[PDB]
Design a protein that fits this description.
part of a larger assembly, 8 chains, A alpha/beta (439), B little secondary structure (50), C little secondary structure (66), D little secondary structure (54), E little secondary structure (33), F alpha+beta (412), G alpha/beta (429), A: 439 residues, alpha/beta, eleven-stranded mixed sheet, two-stranded antiparallel ribbon, 13 strands, 40% helix, F: 412 residues, alpha+beta, six-stranded antiparallel sheet, binds guanosine-5'-triphosphate, binds adenosine-5'-triphosphate, binds guanosine-5'-diphosphate, binds calcium ion, cytoplasm (chains G, H)
Chain lengths: 439, 50, 66, 54, 33, 412, 429, 429
């Protein structure tokens, strides 16, 4: 019951999933070897690990995750790391040659010889689940594998699994910094998949996470490890509603109905608070109102897209820990009283609240100070057209004289696919503007 | 054997950081190049004694 | 005519219909037969402009479900 | 014919502290720290419960 | 005098240890209330 | 049926028959990283020559871990001196060394033998290391080697020749130095042990001699956790029985003198490794030192191989990083204080409170916070081995103290 | 996965000899083939460059290949010579005479049968060949002509596999061969039309590095080839060791070659300190990037000031944090947008490897597709016009079977490449 | 199952002498005829080539054949010459003159009755004789003529028994007999209709293998005979020893002879490695396949590049995995379809035996019915036509009783055979 299948695609998805699972194992009680102490279990009928782990008769708790990469450079690290015993030897699928920042290579030449094995692993994960809420795919559309093979896997999953919910946590290209030159191409090519075959899309660009780590975690050397730790914390905060009981329990579709107003309007920004260091934790009034204000501030958000420059459509706040409904409602009221953030006219309430009694647990050697109360934001807002317009401008600049297009053409794509993807993303941005426009 | 112990003991090579080598090969005074390719079938392979 | 290689094979060939399972993963080491090229080398028949070998796989239209 | 001169040999230990120089690809062990989790009702409580009613 | 044969080029690309302002790539403007 | 289980080289599959003795051995050191390593080698009697290899399991091309071998000591006719007493004299002259040198013998390659190859041929080891033979196969052996020299130096087990310390430095091929303790030094050691049981560790003798091991946590290049005179004086001060009123100058001086001559007695009782004086500042100099192992053989009894291996197995199961360190959170999540008789039937202690007390037992590592070294673990179970006599009881205690999965995680 | 390396000519053979010395030191390989290494990660991915034998001896996937067996004798009698396989040595009976025609059509045509016979074996001896890497000099006869013949046949047989050609481009000031313009012009268009990513290296820039960047007293070709060995190891460190942001040869090609003909890059290594200079500089990501983009550190002699960077790539090594490295690699663009290209946002590719080189805190290798290599191409072409206009040193090539219009069509490719570089440098948005 | 061997001429005598050297070493049989081996499998099937006497001495089932008793006495003086039965040495009084005419018609006939008598006695002694075997040279006088006579008479007397023949082919480079074209022409048209299959052995191929591949400074004719005897012994490895996939001489014939006249094969052995190079390589089934299909290891001097493999057979020795021996046979066809015939899917038969030869990890004998035997046939036909046009050395054959019609129809048969191979070389599906 309440299972959610994690699908990590690409290198970035692999490290994000590694962080997510090292957080989940310590959250529930599972050791790095995959076993679970009898004490980390209320009784014979305890089932918190059920949604994320399957209990084997030999005592292991195998995660319900599929790691998937076209090169072994990350799965071998996983199999040499601390969770080799935890992770199933299968459901850890790797290829031989990487797509090498090529959507064409990941979606038309080498992703096609991997997608059916990936689907078989996904099916063997799902048939073990009697109450599967949905899939949670972690990837970065910046690279080649996560864009191409991610799109292929999303398409085939949408084809074969019908109307199962699909949360795509994707690391979009950042407005300023990037680690590729064909990354705008990859993002523009994968945006159609992220729009149609991803039921709810979440933006996790490295930029806002880096700035947040610098300014709030007091970390002079932020890195991918810290970014993935924070992303895993956000994922755990969102999905803990069905893991631990609370005053306002929600499920996947339960917050999806309140989050998604229209089928094409499902891209939602994310934020987390109080994401602060141990030194800063004992210097600040970590109240529910304070953490809610930090959430609604762009400082705490994980995507470089200012909502105060746009209009909110539906904000879902997952509170965890010692929160109280009165504190939640008072925070919501003092957020309405602020005029820096405007809700769309046709959505008077625009607020979903989900309260969970389990406070977040910090990984040892981590950076987040474990705070007794926390809150995560999944907000649908019209401001998100900013990032799509900017990546469209980057794509237009790159494609003005058809640079770097010969690989995409020669690895199994028509020249018109770029134009089709560009017009699809332009239509997406235009429909965000139409829905955000006043009556 | 003590002599066998010293013979086993060997010096481990320094790391080859670029730009820190100083042309050590110039201090050989005899540069005769034995013709080990084309006239030698063994190609000067080194094999230990029995 | 050829019937096509069976699904879920661990044996890989070149330019044939391939199952989506990771068949290439199980390729083992291969013995090759050389072909004489010194005879084909000809100073008169030389390298032209635009004559380089480019690996271009055919592009097949893929329908997108909306 | 004069005999050839012997090849000049460099000393094996030019620097007084050459021994300290490390020659291992991974010299330092990975840094790892751990803190004991605070035991509380949150550790085992607040867990979803399923029973058959039987 | 025998002079070394050096390429006649000079350096042009310079960076810093913590170049960007406050190690924040972009800082959101504040709208008052 | 004969060849169904046969390999490429089974005796039935091969038409040729070979003469060799195949021995698996493991290195002896305080380092858990080294103790994890497994070694295999073989001895050919035709040439009286044996080779040694280390096996490591890391992922191959197919995505799953594979075992492969790294030359630990290449094939060679290794020679040991016939006379350990005359080894020093033979080292002076080349001809005397040749006369004294003898090749190894098949009798040397029995189980539990402690063999020494000399300087390492690989960089995995930084000094001369001892190899304990854990298994021997003589199925393909057809001939028995005999030493040509009249006097024979044979590798022997530590249990085979007790009250001896093996020192690789003094003589090539490994040698045994007897340890002589009189009744005075012996019962002084027992009293020091008992004062540690009472004062540093509280009521619990396990924590008592765990507190003993505190000044002796560093592991040298050759393993063999050493005791310098400063370490011994720290041990005497930690024994804590030698106390004085701080306001009384005469009493303070008397206590200091008692600590000094107690340290002198303890240090001089045990055999000393000769100090080294390297010419260059780079090469490490070692002071006069005694082995923590030979000291603890007397101060807490003798531990047998099964007990030692059970200790190592528990440590390996608790250690996931394969870095010879256990996190305090791992210690917390695996202590089984909750099903403990005292909390369940006796109700003297509560589960959480006993668990947090056990967490407080482990001292903080200066280098890495929240990490429990294998020296920590070995000293703590030295406590249990000292306090109990029955090997079956020790095995049961190790089975029941840690809620470990007991799966076989050794690569072999 | 695996990378197979061929080394042509005396220059390329010495380059590969020092490269294999460096790789053997990095992976802990004794010259006697037996393993001697230090960490587990060394043998996690040693098979990319080494094939194992029955006894565990590791033999490089190296094809030593040249008409003069003297360099073969030198490399095999050297310190790490006993590492190479015997059959991997291919030798003729007479030298190339520094003649592209002799190396490419008369002498190299007879040896190419055995060259390809051993090269196919070494290429299919691995589970998944990533690509080919040929080290050579364009000024010589056997290194340039016969090496490009090998490149053409290897591309014909393996169209999809990636190709690198570490070519040591000559310079008139350091002209160590008078037919260097002819040989270079004949080989550059072969590289253009049959090499996935060439690698231009110039003795002028290496010597400038040795004089001012290193301040070496008497640096010999061993010291000089240490740098090319460093960059050759750096371009595959991502394959050989795990990293936070891994990459590969096809990764570099895709992120660095905007158009098929523009695949020529200029190299650079950092850190690279002078003799008495370590105590005067603190090794950090900032100074790594400063020396990487630093002009004199470019080990190909062409001033980046006069050109604009089409693409750049930085293969950083060592345990780091990605935020500082991409801070540096974005801020360099931010305050040097004049030296970059506007219509390609973020001309820079970044890769991170978790294993630093032997005895270094950090390191980086630079791949630079700067448009100012058109200056080197034009300087080669002008002197090619000078020699070809008077038929000087042309009777050798004509009598070795080649036709005169070969030179004309190669220089036509030169002019086309120069024109493409110029019209992509001056193009606007 | 028993195989009885015949040794025709001095070529056959020395070849069979070294063959019995190899067989005695394999079965642990000393020259005195006793057994000092260390395995039961030596006695398990020792009856295939040996017959035990009353005293336990193992006499080989061998017949020796020569007009020249000089080679007879040399074999007797050999280290293992006492093994053969004294009555199995059949010799004449006059030499063969290196003449097929007097080796097949005049002097061959006066001894053919006695040699048939002794062969018949050997077949009687055999519990159920599976195959006659012959070792000889087509270019000789008595090895060729009397060998053809005996194989023909064996064909009529034993039509249901396998007829192995091991024929040494001449070559212009090695040519040490001016009438090699005549003898080969007169012998090929006998072996076509009198031998079930006939692999060809060529001395320049042997020399090339022992020089370029095996790298012996002074390889002797003795270990050249050892090299041929290795395959001659491995052809019946499954006959003499158990295996997961056994096969015998008829199994080879039926899986290697698509049509009755197309039965001219080539040997191949692996691992044939120079001692100075096999320290550098790791013995494996994959490179055993690489060698067996490699042109330089083809111990008949006719490349497979210009021909298409009708059928092939790989008899592996040593415990192995069936696919690691099977993909190496399959994907070779998959990737070299230009060198394999389409209308014969899976051209290679594989066989596995548990016992490998002495001092080896594992071995393999390759037997290929490649279409390139037409090259040898065309060469010998052209040489024969050149000599026959001027009737050179024809008087030595016509004075012994032949007529030109025999030569004309033998040459016509060989030309039909070369046309016959060419038709399937260029045949379409
Ligand atoms: N959060 C996070 N993002 C990462 C990490 N590693 C890479 N990325 C992001 O991934 C983007 C590029 O994708 P890649 O790293 O190449 O991974 P990929 O999508 O699988 O592409 P390939 O490497 O070609 O397979 C970069 O812009 C990074 O922002 C990581 O460890 N954590
Ligand atoms: N409590 C312990 N549990 C497990 N291993 C230990 C413990 N204490 C020490 N060791 C290690 O076990 C090994 C035993 O050391 P050593 O060979 O000197 O012992 P010994 O007393 O001479 O002989 P024996 O091993 O036969 O008991 C060393 O590597 C030591 O570091
Ligand atoms: N870096 C480096 N360059 C070299 C070396 N040997 C030769 N060269 C360069 O190669 C050019 C001459 O080419 P050459 O070596 O004769 O080519 P070959 O005739 O094909 O072997 C000269 O300009 C040298 O600068 C070497 O060992 N290292
Ligand atoms: N393999 C092998 N070949 C041989 C031997 N003797 C001769 N030959 C080859 O056979 C050819 C000539 O055979 P020949 O001596 O006339 O045979 P003969 O008629 O019995 O004397 C030559 O080309 C030799 O290379 C031998 O003992 N072994
Ligand atoms: Ca650990
Ligand atoms: Mg990747």
């Amino acid at each position: 019951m309440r299972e959610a299948i994690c699908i990590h695609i690409g290198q970035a998805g692999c490290q994000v999933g590694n962080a997510c699972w090292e957080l989940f194992c310590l959250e529930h009680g599972i050791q790095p070897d995959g076993s679970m102490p009898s004490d980390k279990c209320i009784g014979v009928e305890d089932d918190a690990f059920n949604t994320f782990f399957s209990e084997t008769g030999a005592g292991k708790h195998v995660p319900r995750c599929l790691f998937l990469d076209l090169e072994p450079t990350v799965v071998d690290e996983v199999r040499t790391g601390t969770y080799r015993q935890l992770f199933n030897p299968e459901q850890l699928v790797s290829g031989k040659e990487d797509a090498a920042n090529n959507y064409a290579r990941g979606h038309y030449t080498i992703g096609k010889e991997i997608v059916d094995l990936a689907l078989d692993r996904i099916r063997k994960l799902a048939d073990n689940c009697t109450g599967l809420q949905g899939f949670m795919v972690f990837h970065a559309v910046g690279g080649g594998t996560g864009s191409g093979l991610g799109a292929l896997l999303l398409e085939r999953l949408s084809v074969d699994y019908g109307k199962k919910s699909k949360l795509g946590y994707t690391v979009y290209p950042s407005p300023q910094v990037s680690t590729a030159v064909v990354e705008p191409y990859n993002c523009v090519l994968s945006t159609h998949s992220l729009l149609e075959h991803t039921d709810v899309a979440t933006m996790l660009d490295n930029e806002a996470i880096y700035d947040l780590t610098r300014r709030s975690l007091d970390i002079e050397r932020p890195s991918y490890t810290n970014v993935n730790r924070l992303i895993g914390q956000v994922v755990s905060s969102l999905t803990a509603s069905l893991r631990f009981d609370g005053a306002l329990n929600v499920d996947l579709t339960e917050f999806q109905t309140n989050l998604v107003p229209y089928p094409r309007i499902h891209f939602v920004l994310t934020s987390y608070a109080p994401v602060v260091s141990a030194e800063k934790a004992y210097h600040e009034q970590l109240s529910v109102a304070d953490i809610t204000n930090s959430v609604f501030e762009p400082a705490g958000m994980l995507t470089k897209c200012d909502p105060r420059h746009g209009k909110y459509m539906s904000c879902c706040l997952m509170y965890r820990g010692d929160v109280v409904p009165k504190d939640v409602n008072a925070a919501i009221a003092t957020i309405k009283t602020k005029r820096t953030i405007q809700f769309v006219d046709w959505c008077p309430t625009g607020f979903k609240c989900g309260i969970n009694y389990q406070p977040p647990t910090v990984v040892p050697g981590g950076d987040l100070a474990k705070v007794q109360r926390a809150v995560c934001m999944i907000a649908n807002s019209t401001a998100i057209a900013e990032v799509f317009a900017r990546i469209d401008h980057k794509f237009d600049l790159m494609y003005s004289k058809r640079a770097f297009v010969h690989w995409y053409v020669g690895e199994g794509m028509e020249e018109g696919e770029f134009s089709e993807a560009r017009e699809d993303l332009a239509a997406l941005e235009k429909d965000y503007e139409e829905v955000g426009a006043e009556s | 054997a003590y002599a066998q112990s010293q013979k086993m003991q060997k010096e481990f090579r320094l790391p080859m950081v670029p730009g820190l080598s100083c042309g050590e090969e110039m201090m050989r005074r005899n540069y005769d190049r034995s013709q080990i390719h084309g006239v030698r079938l063994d190609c000067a392979t080194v094999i230990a004694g029995v | 005519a050829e019937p096509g290689k069976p699904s879920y094979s661990t044996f890989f060939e070149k330019a044939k219909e391939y199952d989506g399972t990771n068949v290439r993963f199980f390729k083992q080491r291969e013995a090759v037969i050389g072909k004489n090229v010194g005879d084909t080398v000809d100073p008169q028949k030389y390298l032209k402009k635009g004559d380089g070998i480019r690996y271009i796989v055919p592009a097949t239209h893929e329908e997108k479900v909306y | 014919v004069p005999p050839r001169a012997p090849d000049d040999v460099v000393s094996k230990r030019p620097y007084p502290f050459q021994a300290e120089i490390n020659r291992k690809l991974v010299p330092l062990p990975k840094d790892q720290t751990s803190h004991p989790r605070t035991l509380d009702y949150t550790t085992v409580g607040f867990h979803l419960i399923l029973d058959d009613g039987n | 005098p025998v002079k070394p044969n050096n390429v006649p080029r000079q350096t042009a690309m310079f960076t810093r240890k913590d170049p960007l302002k406050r190690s924040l790539f972009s800082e959101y403007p504040y709208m008052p209330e | 049926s004969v060849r169904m289980n046969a390999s490429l080289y089974s005796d039935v599959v091969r038409i040729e028959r070979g003469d060799y003795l195949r021995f698996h051995c493991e290195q002896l050191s305080a380092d858990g990283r080294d103790t994890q390593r497994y070694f295999f080698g073989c001895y050919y009697p035709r040439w009286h020559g044996f080779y040694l290899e280390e096996v490591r399991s890391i992922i191959g091309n197919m995505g799953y871990c594979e075992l492969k071998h790294f030359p630990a000591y290449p094939f060679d006719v290794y020679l040991k001196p016939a006379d350990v007493t005359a080894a020093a004299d033979s080292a002076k002259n080349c001809d005397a060394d040749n006369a004294n040198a003898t090749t190894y013998i098949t009798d040397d390659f029995q189980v539990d033998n402690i063999l020494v190859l000399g300087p390492p041929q690989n960089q995995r080891d930084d000094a001369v290391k001892r190899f304990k033979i854990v298994s021997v196969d003589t199925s393909h052996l057809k001939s028995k080697t005999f030493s040509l020299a009249p006097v024979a130096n044979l590798n022997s087990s530590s249990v085979q020749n007790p009250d001896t310390m093996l020192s690789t430095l003094r003589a090539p091929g490994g040698e045994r130095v007897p340890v002589q303790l009189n009744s005075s030094v012996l019962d002084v050691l027992t009293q020091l042990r008992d004062a540690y049981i009472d004062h540093a560790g509280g009521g619990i003798p396990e924590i008592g001699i765990k507190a003993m091991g505190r000044p002796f946590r560093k592991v040298s290049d050759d393993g063999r956790r050493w005791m310098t005179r400063d370490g011994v004086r720290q041990l005497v001060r930690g024994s804590r029985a030698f106390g004085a009123h701080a306001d009384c100058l005469s009493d303070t001086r008397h206590a200091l003198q008692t600590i000094e001559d107690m340290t002198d007695t303890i240090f001089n009782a045990f055999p000393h490794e000769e100090a080294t004086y390297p010419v260059a500042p780079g090469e490490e100099a070692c002071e006069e030192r005694i082995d923590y192992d030979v000291f603890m053989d007397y101060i807490r009894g003798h531990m047998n191989s099964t007990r030692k291996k059970a200790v190592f197995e528990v440590f390996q199961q608790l250690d996931y990083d394969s870095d010879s360190n256990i996190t305090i959170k791992d210690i917390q999540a695996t202590f089984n204080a909750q099903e403990h008789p005292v909390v369940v039937s006796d109700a003297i202690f509560t589960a959480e409170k006993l668990l947090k007390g056990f967490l407080s037992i482990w001292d903080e590592n200066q280098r890495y916070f929240g990490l429990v070294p294998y020296t920590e673990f070995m000293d703590y179970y030295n406590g249990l081995s000292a306090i109990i006599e029955d090997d079956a009881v020790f095995l049961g205690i190790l089975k029941t103290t840690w809620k470990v999965p007991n799966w076989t995680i050794k690569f072999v | 996965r695996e990378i197979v390396s061929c080394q042509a000519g005396q220059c390329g053979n010495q380059i590969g000899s020092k490269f294999w010395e460096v790789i053997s030191d990095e992976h802990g390989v004794d010259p006697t083939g037996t393993y001697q290494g230090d960490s587990d990660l060394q043998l996690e991915r040693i098979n990319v460059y080494f094939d194992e034998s029955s006894g565990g001896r590791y033999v490089p996937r190296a094809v030593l290949m040249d008409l003069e067996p003297g360099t073969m004798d030198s490399v095999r009698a050297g310190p790490y010579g006993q590492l190479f396989r015997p059959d991997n040595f291919i030798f003729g009976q007479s030298g190339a005479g520094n003649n592209w025609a002799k190396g490419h059509y008369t002498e190299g045509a007879e040896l190419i049968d055995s060259v390809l016979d051993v090269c196919r074996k070494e290429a299919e001896s691995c589970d998944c060949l990533q690509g080919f890497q040929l080290s050579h000099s364009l000024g010589g006869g056997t290194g340039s002509g016969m090496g490009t013949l090998l490149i053409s046949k290897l591309r014909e047989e393996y169209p999809d596999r990636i190709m690198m050609t570490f070519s040591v481009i000559p310079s008139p000031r350091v002209s160590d061969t008078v037919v260097e313009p002819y040989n270079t012009t004949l080989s550059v268009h072969q590289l253009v039309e049959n090499s996935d990513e060439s690698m231009c290296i110039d003795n002028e820039a290496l010597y400038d590095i040795c004089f001012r960047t290193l301040k070496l007293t008497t640096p010999t070709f061993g010291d000089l080839n240490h740098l090319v060995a460093a960059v050759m190891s750096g371009v595959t460190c991502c394959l050989r060791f795990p990293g936070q942001l891994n990459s590969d040869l096809r990764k570099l090609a895709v992120n660095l070659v905007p158009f098929p003909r523009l695949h020529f890059f200029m190299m650079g290594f950092a850190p690279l300190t002078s003799r008495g200079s370590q105590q005067y500089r603190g090794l950090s990501v900032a100074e790594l990037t400063q020396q990487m983009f630093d002009a004199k550190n470019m080990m190909q002699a062409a001033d980046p000031r006069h050109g604009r960077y089409l693409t750049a790539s930085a293969l950083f090594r060592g345990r780091m944090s990605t935020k500082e490295v991409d801070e540096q690699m974005l801020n360099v663009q931010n305050k040097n947008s004049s030296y970059f290209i506007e219509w390609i946002p973020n001309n820079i590719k970044s890769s991170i490897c978790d294993i630093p080189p032997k005895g270094l805190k950090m390191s980086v290798t630079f791949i630079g597709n700067n448009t100012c290599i058109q200056e080197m191409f034009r300087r080669v072409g002008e002197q090619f016009t000078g020699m070809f206009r008077r038929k000087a040193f042309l009777h050798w090539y004509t009598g070795e079977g080649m036709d005169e219009m070969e030179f004309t069509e190669a220089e036509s490719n030169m002019n086309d490449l120069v024109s493409e570089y110029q019209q992509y440098q001056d193009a606007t948005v």
